[PDB]
Amino acid sequence: LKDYALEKEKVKKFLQEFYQKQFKYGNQLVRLAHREQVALYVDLDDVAEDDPELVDSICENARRYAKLFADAVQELLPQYKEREVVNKDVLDVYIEHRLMMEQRSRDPGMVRSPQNQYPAELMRRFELYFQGPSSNKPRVIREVRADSVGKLVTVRGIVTRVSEVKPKMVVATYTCDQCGAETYQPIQSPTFMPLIMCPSQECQTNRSGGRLYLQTRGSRFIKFQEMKMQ
Amino acid sequence: RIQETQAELPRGSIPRSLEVILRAEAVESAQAGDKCDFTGTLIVVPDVSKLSTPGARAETNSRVSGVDGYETEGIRGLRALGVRDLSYRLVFLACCVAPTNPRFGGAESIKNQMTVKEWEKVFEMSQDKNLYHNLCTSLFPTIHGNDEVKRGVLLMLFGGVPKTTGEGTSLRGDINVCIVGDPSTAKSQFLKHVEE
Numbered sequence: 001l002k003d004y005a006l007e008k009e010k011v012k013k014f015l016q017e018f019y020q021k022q023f024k025y026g027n028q029l030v031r032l033a034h035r036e037q038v039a040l041y042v043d044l045d046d047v048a049e050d051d052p053e054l055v056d057s058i059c060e061n062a063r064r065y066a067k068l069f070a071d072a073v074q075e076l077l078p079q080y081k082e083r084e085v086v087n088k089d090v091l092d093v094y095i096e097h098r099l100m101m102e103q104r105s106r107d108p109g110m111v112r113s114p115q116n117q118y119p120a121e122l123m124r125r126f127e128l129y130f131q132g133p134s135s136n137k138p139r140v141i142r143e144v145r146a147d148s149v150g151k152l153v154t155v156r157g158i159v160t161r162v163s164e165v166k167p168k169m170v171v172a173t174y175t176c177d178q179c180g181a182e183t184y185q186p187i188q189s190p191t192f193m194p195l196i197m198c199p200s201q202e203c204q205t206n207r208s209g210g211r212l213y214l215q216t217r218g219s220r221f222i223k224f225q226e227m228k229m230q
Numbered sequence: 231r232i233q234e235t236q237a238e239l240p241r242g243s244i245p246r247s248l249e250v251i252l253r254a255e256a257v258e259s260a261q262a263g264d265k266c267d268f269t270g271t272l273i274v275v276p277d278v279s280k281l282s283t284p285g286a287r288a289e290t291n292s293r294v295s296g297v298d299g300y301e302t303e304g305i306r307g308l309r310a311l312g313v314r315d316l317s318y319r320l321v322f323l324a325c326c327v328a329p330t331n332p333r334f335g336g337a338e339s340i341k342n343q344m345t346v347k348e349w350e351k352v353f354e355m356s357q358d359k360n361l362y363h364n365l366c367t368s369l370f371p372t373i374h375g376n377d378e379v380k381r382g383v384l385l386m387l388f389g390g391v392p393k394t395t396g397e398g399t400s401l402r403g404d405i406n407v408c409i410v411g412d413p414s415t416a417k418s419q420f421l422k423h424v425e426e
């Protein structure tokens with residue numbers, strides 16, 4: 001029970017202010033902004049070098065802080081961005097086009113509903129992960145039990161099996177047959193049900209169907225693998 | 231259920247098989263093992279749950295939406311719109327069925343079925359003497375020698391008369407033949423001749 005906005009400002013402080021003097025995370029942020037790097041690896045030893053109690057909070061509550069770190073770095077990218085990305089990937093072209101059209105029709109003073117927004121993971125194009133603290137002792141798969149749920153464990157074992165990289169949905173995208181507005185459905189469950197009707201303002205106002213169709217093209221996927229360690 | 235004739239196979243291909251529906255009066259005419267020509271439509275019979283991937287689906291074109299608390303989403307939504315996959319499968323609809331290699335253009339019944347030309351042909355065949363060696367030669371023009379095998383296999387094709395006792399013992403009528411010999415002595419060749 002801590003003020004997550006306060007902790008968000010603190011993780012911003014750590015990301016901006018850390019050095020070793022070369023600003024490790026600053027340079028990684030520049031590389032992120034240029035899209036020369038698709039995943040960032042935070043080092044909890046580096047976190048604890050200044051704020052060990054922050055590392056304590058992360059370890060006792062990891063996934064929350066995965067989300068908070070991701071959001072903070074998303075917010076911090078434009079500060080370090082120097083030059084326009086070269087639009088390497090079709091996904092990057094999609095995010096650039098969506099940013100273009102939302103800035104076009106923004107009406108900057110105007111206020112919009114929370115759901116009339118781009119899902120926060122749809123625009124990232126960077127992953128954030130943790131490298132566990134050396135202070136933590138590597139556990140054993142029998143010992144890791146219910147009291148470790150939601151916590152950042154460190155474990156060692158032999159990888160006995162792994163599936164091949166399959167694409168996994170993270171934000172399904174849909175298009176109406178009426179209003180010409182994309183729709184987005186985030187994903188948290190292993191499975192999901194796909195939408196049918198359109199929640200776009202124009203479709204609801206005109207009281208037309210707007211039976212949106214799922215698009216594999218404008219959606220986001222992430223590489224997905226599963227391994228059985230022991 | 232019918233499958234591709236052995237002549238029409240492509241290279242490395244399993245014989246495809248498709249299901250043929252036989253409506254009234256053309257119904258018991260086909261039988262298992264025959265070589266039948268079929269004539270009729272190619273229709274499509276609806277299939278459902280043939281694939282684990284979503285495919286083509288029908289739905290009404292009415293522009294209804296869903297009120298709050300009854301919103302046309304999920305299972306309620308699909309039932310309301312009447313969504314249904316359209317997965318089909320070819321199923322031939324045989325209008326008629328004939329043998330692909332008919333025996334006749336149609337003992338007394340078969341004799342009536344005989345045309346005049348074939349009847350006189352088999353008549354002079356029966357009246358022929360040396361029909362023994364003639365049948366040997368006709369069955370096995372390729373073979374040389376092996377006259378005993380020729381004779382035995384011919385008699386096998388004609389067969390004996392099955393009989394049965396008053397008590398109920400089924401006296402055999404068929405006559406089984408065995409060819410045993412050194413390798414490459416036309417044994418499998420004789421069997422192939424009988425097959426073909």
Ligand SMILES: Nc1ncnc2c1ncn2[C@@H]1O[C@H](COP(=O)(O)OP(=O)(O)O)[C@@H](O)[C@H]1O
Nearest residue numbers: 372373374375376413414415416417418419420
């Ligand atoms: N007496 C024969 N007359 C004609 N062909 C023969 C004779 N003996 C052997 N052959 C030839 O030998 C080949 C193989 O004989 P086959 O019966 O297949 O051997 P196996 O009995 O081991 O299967 C045949 O294709 C056939 O042409």
Ligand SMILES: [Mg+2]
Nearest residue numbers: 414417418419
């Ligand atoms: Mg053989």
Ligand SMILES: [Zn+2]
Nearest residue numbers: 176179198200
């Ligand atoms: Zn719409």
